[PDB]
Amino acid sequence: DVPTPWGIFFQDSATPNMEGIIELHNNIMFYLVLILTFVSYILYTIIYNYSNATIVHKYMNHGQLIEIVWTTLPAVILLIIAFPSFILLYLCDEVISPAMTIKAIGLQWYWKYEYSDFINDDGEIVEFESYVIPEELLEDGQLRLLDVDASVVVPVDTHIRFIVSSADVIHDFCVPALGVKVDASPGRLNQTSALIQREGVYYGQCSELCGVMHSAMPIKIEAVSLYEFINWLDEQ
Amino acid sequence: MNYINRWLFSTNAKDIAVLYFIFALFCGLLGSIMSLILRLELSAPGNQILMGNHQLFNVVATAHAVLMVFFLVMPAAIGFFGNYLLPLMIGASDMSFARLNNISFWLLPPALVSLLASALIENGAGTGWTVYPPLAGVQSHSGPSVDLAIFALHLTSISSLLGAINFITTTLNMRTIGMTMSKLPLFVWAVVFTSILLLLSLPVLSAGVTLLLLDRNFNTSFFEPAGGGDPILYQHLFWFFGHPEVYILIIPGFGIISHIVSTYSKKPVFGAIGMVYAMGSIGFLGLLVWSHHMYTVGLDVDSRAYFTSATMVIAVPTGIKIFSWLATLYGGSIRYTTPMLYAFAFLFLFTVGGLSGVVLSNASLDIAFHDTYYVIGHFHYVLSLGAVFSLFAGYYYWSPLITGLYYNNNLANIQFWLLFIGTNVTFFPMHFLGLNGMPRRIPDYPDAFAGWNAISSFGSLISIISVILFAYVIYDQLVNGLTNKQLSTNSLFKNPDFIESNIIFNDNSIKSSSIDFLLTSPPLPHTFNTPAIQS
Amino acid sequence: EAEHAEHRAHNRHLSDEEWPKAYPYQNVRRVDFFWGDGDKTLFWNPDVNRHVK
Amino acid sequence: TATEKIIELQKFYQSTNKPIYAAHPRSKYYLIPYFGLLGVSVAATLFYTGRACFGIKD
Amino acid sequence: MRIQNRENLQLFPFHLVTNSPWPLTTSLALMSLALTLGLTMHGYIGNHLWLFLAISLVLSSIFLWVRDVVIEGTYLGDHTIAVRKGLNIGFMLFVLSEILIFAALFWSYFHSAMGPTIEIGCQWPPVGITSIKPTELPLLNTIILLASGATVTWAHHSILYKDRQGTLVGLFITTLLIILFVGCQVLEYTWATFTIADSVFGSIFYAGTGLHFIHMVMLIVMLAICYARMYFYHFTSNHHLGLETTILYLHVLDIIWLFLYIVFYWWGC
Amino acid sequence: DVGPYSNLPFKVKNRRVPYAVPHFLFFAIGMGIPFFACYVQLKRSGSI
Amino acid sequence: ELKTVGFDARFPQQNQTKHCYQSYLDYHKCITVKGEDFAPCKVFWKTYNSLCPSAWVEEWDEQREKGIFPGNLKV
Amino acid sequence: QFKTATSIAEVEGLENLVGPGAKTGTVPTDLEQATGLERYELLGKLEGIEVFDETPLEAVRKGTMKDPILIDSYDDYRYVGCTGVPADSHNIEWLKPTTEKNARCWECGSVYKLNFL
Numbered sequence A: 001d002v003p004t005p006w007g008i009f010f011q012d013s014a015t016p017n018m019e020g021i022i023e024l025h026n027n028i029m030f031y032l033v034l035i036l037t038f039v040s041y042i043l044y045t046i047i048y049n050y051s052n053a054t055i056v057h058k059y060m061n062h063g064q065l066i067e068i069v070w071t072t073l074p075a076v077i078l079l080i081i082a083f084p085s086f087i088l089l090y091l092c093d094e095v096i097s098p099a100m101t102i103k104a105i106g107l108q109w110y111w112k113y114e115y116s117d118f119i120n121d122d123g124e125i126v127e128f129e130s131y132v133i134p135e136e137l138l139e140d141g142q143l144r145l146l147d148v149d150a151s152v153v154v155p156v157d158t159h160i161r162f163i164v165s166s167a168d169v170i171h172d173f174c175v176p177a178l179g180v181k182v183d184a185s186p187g188r189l190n191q192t193s194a195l196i197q198r199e200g201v202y203y204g205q206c207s208e209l210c211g212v213m214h215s216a217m218p219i220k221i222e223a224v225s226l227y228e229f230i231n232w233l234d235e236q
Numbered sequence B: 001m002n003y004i005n006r007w008l009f010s011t012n013a014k015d016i017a018v019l020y021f022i023f024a025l026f027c028g029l030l031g032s033i034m035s036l037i038l039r040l041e042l043s044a045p046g047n048q049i050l051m052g053n054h055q056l057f058n059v060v061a062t063a064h065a066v067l068m069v070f071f072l073v074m075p076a077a078i079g080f081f082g083n084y085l086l087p088l089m090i091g092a093s094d095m096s097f098a099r100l101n102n103i104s105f106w107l108l109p110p111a112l113v114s115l116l117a118s119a120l121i122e123n124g125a126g127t128g129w130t131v132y133p134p135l136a137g138v139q140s141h142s143g144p145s146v147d148l149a150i151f152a153l154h155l156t157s158i159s160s161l162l163g164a165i166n167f168i169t170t171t172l173n174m175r176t177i178g179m180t181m182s183k184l185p186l187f188v189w190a191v192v193f194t195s196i197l198l199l200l201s202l203p204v205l206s207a208g209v210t211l212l213l214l215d216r217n218f219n220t221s222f223f224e225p226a227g228g229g230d231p232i233l234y235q236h237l238f239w240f241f242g243h244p245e246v247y248i249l250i251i252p253g254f255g256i257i258s259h260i261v262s263t264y265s266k267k268p269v270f271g272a273i274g275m276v277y278a279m280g281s282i283g284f285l286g287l288l289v290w291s292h293h294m295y296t297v298g299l300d301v302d303s304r305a306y307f308t309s310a311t312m313v314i315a316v317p318t319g320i321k322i323f324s325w326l327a328t329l330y331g332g333s334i335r336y337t338t339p340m341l342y343a344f345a346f347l348f349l350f351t352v353g354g355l356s357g358v359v360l361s362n363a364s365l366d367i368a369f370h371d372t373y374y375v376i377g378h379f380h381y382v383l384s385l386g387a388v389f390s391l392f393a394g395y396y397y398w399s400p401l402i403t404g405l406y407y408n409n410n411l412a413n414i415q416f417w418l419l420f421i422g423t424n425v426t427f428f429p430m431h432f433l434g435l436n437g438m439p440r441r442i443p444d445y446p447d448a449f450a451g452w453n454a455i456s457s458f459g460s461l462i463s464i465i466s467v468i469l470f471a472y473v474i475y476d477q478l479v480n481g482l483t484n485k486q487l488s489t490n491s492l493f494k495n496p497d498f499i500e501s502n503i504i505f506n507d508n509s510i511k512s513s514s515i516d517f518l519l520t521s522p523p524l525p526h527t528f529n530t531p532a533i534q535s
Numbered sequence C: 001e002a003e004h005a006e007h008r009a010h011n012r013h014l015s016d017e018e019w020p021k022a023y024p025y026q027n028v029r030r031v032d033f034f035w036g037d038g039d040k041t042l043f044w045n046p047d048v049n050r051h052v053k
Numbered sequence D: 001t002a003t004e005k006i007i008e009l010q011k012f013y014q015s016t017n018k019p020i021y022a023a024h025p026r027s028k029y030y031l032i033p034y035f036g037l038l039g040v041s042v043a044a045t046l047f048y049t050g051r052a053c054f055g056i057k058d
Numbered sequence E: 001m002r003i004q005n006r007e008n009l010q011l012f013p014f015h016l017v018t019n020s021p022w023p024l025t026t027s028l029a030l031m032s033l034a035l036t037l038g039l040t041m042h043g044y045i046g047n048h049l050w051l052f053l054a055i056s057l058v059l060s061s062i063f064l065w066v067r068d069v070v071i072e073g074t075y076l077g078d079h080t081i082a083v084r085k086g087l088n089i090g091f092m093l094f095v096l097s098e099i100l101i102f103a104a105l106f107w108s109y110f111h112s113a114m115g116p117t118i119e120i121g122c123q124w125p126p127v128g129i130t131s132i133k134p135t136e137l138p139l140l141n142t143i144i145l146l147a148s149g150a151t152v153t154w155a156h157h158s159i160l161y162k163d164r165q166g167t168l169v170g171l172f173i174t175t176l177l178i179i180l181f182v183g184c185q186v187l188e189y190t191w192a193t194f195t196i197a198d199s200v201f202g203s204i205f206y207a208g209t210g211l212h213f214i215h216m217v218m219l220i221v222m223l224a225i226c227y228a229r230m231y232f233y234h235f236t237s238n239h240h241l242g243l244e245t246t247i248l249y250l251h252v253l254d255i256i257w258l259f260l261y262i263v264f265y266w267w268g269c
Numbered sequence F: 001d002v003g004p005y006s007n008l009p010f011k012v013k014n015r016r017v018p019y020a021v022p023h024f025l026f027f028a029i030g031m032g033i034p035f036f037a038c039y040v041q042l043k044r045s046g047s048i
Numbered sequence G: 001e002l003k004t005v006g007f008d009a010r011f012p013q014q015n016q017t018k019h020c021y022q023s024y025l026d027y028h029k030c031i032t033v034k035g036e037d038f039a040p041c042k043v044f045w046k047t048y049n050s051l052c053p054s055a056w057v058e059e060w061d062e063q064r065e066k067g068i069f070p071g072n073l074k075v
Numbered sequence H: 001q002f003k004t005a006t007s008i009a010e011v012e013g014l015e016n017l018v019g020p021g022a023k024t025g026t027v028p029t030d031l032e033q034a035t036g037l038e039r040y041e042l043l044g045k046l047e048g049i050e051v052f053d054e055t056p057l058e059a060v061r062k063g064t065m066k067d068p069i070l071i072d073s074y075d076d077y078r079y080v081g082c083t084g085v086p087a088d089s090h091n092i093e094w095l096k097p098t099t100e101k102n103a104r105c106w107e108c109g110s111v112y113k114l115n116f117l
């Protein structure tokens, strides 16, 4: 969705993959907070008790049990972290039957979208180019450096496969709410999959550096219902 | 003529370290002013100081990266502290190859000239620090800028290789009479373990940079996909250098902290053999992982699972060092002088900046954080607050011994607190901007990212004032520094004990565990005539 | 390699329409060389190699 | 005399009172062209890197 | 240390170098080489006689170092047992670094040989590029290298048995058995069908077998200075470190050539 | 001549011009070069 | 009712750059023989029109019409 | 430059270590061509005398102020590292004995005196 002004945390989700990402991050933060609090308490004890002290225990320098406890205990934390990470890596993808394909080619400083299906017998494939609206030509209420002239319009509750490539340099397709971040390198095709659960608008920005106009190249996705998608596809 | 044969045609290892320090100060001033230029543009939405030019923003970021990865941290941590202290700790007169030390210094001022001349003959070199192939070709950057910038990464490579071979060759056969290679101090082990990575990493960088040059100007097409190549190959050939590099910057810091923790807390280090084995494990496991910088390029599903497993393992040896530092500081007596303030501010902020690396190691979570300001906030807590703090602590520790002139304590404490406050204000809201979704390398941003960018522009002006106060601390050290040893008892290297009387303490003042603090303090030009004896 | 030295002396008076066909990726000239003309490398004999426009 | 001047030049490089690189009566022929041409090579790459910052080409 | 007049001689077996000017001049030559090569390749100079001066001054700077390395060892006499061990460790740590440049170039070959792209129709040596047959001149070079590896063993085993005519002849035969390699490999670069710009294949083949060419000019130079320094009586039967470094450098290049002949010349499919 | 002001490349005491000028000019050049670079590349590209 | 390409387990990875090329070559192989109007050679037509960008197909068609094409179309 | 030595009893400097010459047509021996600190080691090792010692510190007996351990040096100072009487008990503590003062090792207590040769 849209960024919020004084943000602290993630944007809201519309895909199961982003919810899995949020849940895994909130699982890791538990153990990291535990470790930081333990270290901070030990430095507080050291500052409060053993500052400018008369007695120096200068012969406690070996240890045998305690060096095993700070070697095996972080390992168990790594195994507990590594279980849901591998489950999220393997499980949530396009296991069964994607239902559409949209090719999002990245040119120099704009985007080119081809809806590769809906082909006539002569090759009448629906296609458009998305640019950025300049600041001088904005209407009342539009978002600066994020609002486009043509937006990618998709149905809800439908698996969508994005195939991303490029024609000039290395780009990066990003819609933060949907959990999509894949490169666009000029000689190979890459694929991602998205399922959208609620209607709305979803905004995104390019990531990998491309030249002077890196900051003006937005991505906008609308998620209409099926009837509106059929009525929109019979107009373009 | 005596000026020339002693400060230009030199053989002495300790007289090149002072030249390295003077060079590093200049090359750390230039990049800091370049960072102030960037942070004064990323303040409020619009086009403020650079009028409409998105070039001369990427050039400033590239030249701020290069001048402080290659020209500040490495010359300070290798030239000033490695050339000076390692012969005195191992007990040698000079280095084994002294003329190679002189060439390893003098290759760097021709490397500064080409980099400063890579930003005046053209638009410039706005390729980023990682000079990726299909942007840095002859279709976006067509001029003598990228070529003169990748010739500044050859001379530094030659200098580092020639220094590393000298460091390895010296510590093997130029020790004193009674030192095996198990009684060495920890700083010598840090220099050895960074010098092995300097051998094993730099040929890959030199090959990748030279093949990029041949692609640009001799139309060879290694990395162009219209002739049968892939850009991704370059990424491999870059990052195999990249991750050894970022341990090269941090391993010489660690040993310095150990000495301070061993000194101002009057206890030996808990488990030294565990510490050298931990540094060896960290050095070895920095070569078997390089592809966690590239999770979004389109790798396999069985290759991400290897690189998530091999990245989180490095947390296990670093925890041994952190907990051993806590066990060393636990029992003993602690007096808070100006090296131990920087020592205490390093054990907390390296942990905070390093715990973010576990969140970024997962391939599932890197889809939300790649090319985002969370990465910037991660590596600034470790680079600016882990390496520069170790450099300041090493300067305030070893500068009275080298120079012979003391410094004002109060102004150094004011400098430390200003650095702490300003740097913690600067790099903490970058985590929030990263979690909300702000990408990297953008001059202008949407209006939602305004407010935190107003706060991170305030701490930089605090840190530059601390740099100016550091300059005044150096000036007050050089002038009237003989009279700055009776103001405070910080000048004493170790304090009197409980039963040790003052009259007994004035006869026997220095108690040490190395050769360093028993020398006369200007160190002599030829410091060992007869050999040293260890049982 | 002296029996092959008489199958290369006749590959010089061949016309431009009888030389072997040129694929893509075949003669990449996207930056001109700085020595002499820009269509010739260091080692370049016309008897074995040619660049047909 | 013979090809064993080794026992003669080892009494010359010791007790010389000059540096090693300018001790023999032959080092003029090596050291004069080298330092002569180095001061042209350096003075030509500081004229073509300042002419080129102003946009002048050849 | 209780020998009688011990104060008059140095008390530790390490070499204190006198003050030398050559590190500054090498850096001033590399400044000129870097800036001139960066400038002549994009205009701005035109005349190509400044680059050649830069390369000539660099090579004369290394030669002027090696003079003062020779005079400090055969005339002044400061090379004890420890300093020789340091020099051997040093040279081994440059041979190791010069191997790892070839590792990156071999990995740039296997990243394209196994898995070629779609632009090249998926095939090594691709359509329209005729490769070099490995039953021609790349056999002659291999047998000349294996013979040159055998002739220097007759030269290192004739300086230990104190035979002078038998060290000069073997070094002469080796020096003419590396010049023929360069002469054969410059004839295999003028009778080829494909250039540096004709593929990713013609671009990696002339970049792994072209660094070897530069590395074998160095053996011709290092063997000339080993024949000439033996003719003028500088080598004893137990103190010779110029031969030992040239022998270790030749064998590494032979083993590298035996991996540039099975991967580059024979294996194509 | 070994002593507390002998290992430094610059003279500090008993000097004609006082040390404040060479100490200040070093930092002045160090924090003034990257503004000159931005001035040159701004003026070469039209904008003021 | 919105139907596209399925799984095709011989290419299971994230790089679909070989699926495009293989579908193009297979379509032209089965159209050189067996006529131009035949039923299973429209599975391939819908297969490479659903993954490949259009400019690649235009360049490949021009390279085919000039005789200059690296491929294995000759069976 | 002067009379050549035969044993290290006749070596009063670097002026006695040039040597005779080799003959025309012979690979020379190290006793016919060596000058500096290299020939001094050579004349030491063909008799049994080690010129450059590598023997560590005495770790047998302690140090009393009446009977101190004598450390031999050609200077007025020499750096001595103590690590114990059973040779690894005491940690590493470094000391500087001088011709005007004796070091005393704050942990274990051995006294070191300097013998000026």
Ligand code: HEA
Residues within 6 Å of the ligand: A035, A074, A077, A078, B246, B247, B249, B250, B292, B293, B294, B311, B312, B314, B315, B316, B318, B319, B322, B350, B351, B353, B354, B355, B357, B358, B360, B361, B362, B366, B369, B370, B371, B375, B378, B379, B382, B383
């Ligand atoms: C400054 C040197 C440095 C250091 C120390 C590190 C430390 C680590 N780095 Fe590296 N890293 C960089 C250099 C460095 N990094 C740089 C410069 C970048 C930015 C990339 C750029 O753009 O070029 C980067 C970015 C970066 C990324 C993000 C790449 C991307 O943008 O997608 C990742 C993710 O895998 C990573 C890995 C790690 C890990 C796991 C550590 C770990 O070593 C951190 C270890 C610290 C601890 C873990 C503290 C130990 C405390 C304990 C008590 C242990 C407790 C045990 C548990 C936590 C289980 N680094």
Ligand code: HEA
Residues within 6 Å of the ligand: B024, B025, B028, B029, B031, B032, B035, B036, B038, B039, B061, B062, B064, B065, B068, B069, B073, B076, B128, B129, B130, B376, B380, B383, B384, B388, B391, B392, B395, B426, B440, B441, B442, B460, B463, B467
């Ligand atoms: C070397 C590590 C390092 C250091 C020190 C710093 C210093 C700072 N950096 Fe960071 N920064 C990077 C690592 C580092 N940075 C890198 C690698 C990049 C490039 C990323 C890219 O290209 O994609 C970058 C770029 C970068 C950007 C541009 C981001 C982009 O364009 O996408 C910004 C902007 O906010 C920023 C922030 C800051 C700030 C405010 C400082 C301030 O701290 C600056 C003030 C400096 C000081 C506080 C220390 C002064 C030092 C001395 C004077 C001490 C000398 C030492 C001795 C005396 C022994 N940095």
Ligand code: CUA
Residues within 6 Å of the ligand: A106, A107, A108, A109, A110, A170, A171, A172, A206, A207, A208, A209, A210, A214, A217
């Ligand atoms: Cu376009 Cu990024």
Ligand SMILES: [Cu+2]
Residues within 6 Å of the ligand: B243, B292, B293
């Ligand atoms: Cu990394």
Ligand SMILES: [Zn+2]
Residues within 6 Å of the ligand: H082, H083, H084, H090, H093, H105, H107, H108, H109, H110
């Ligand atoms: Zn003791």
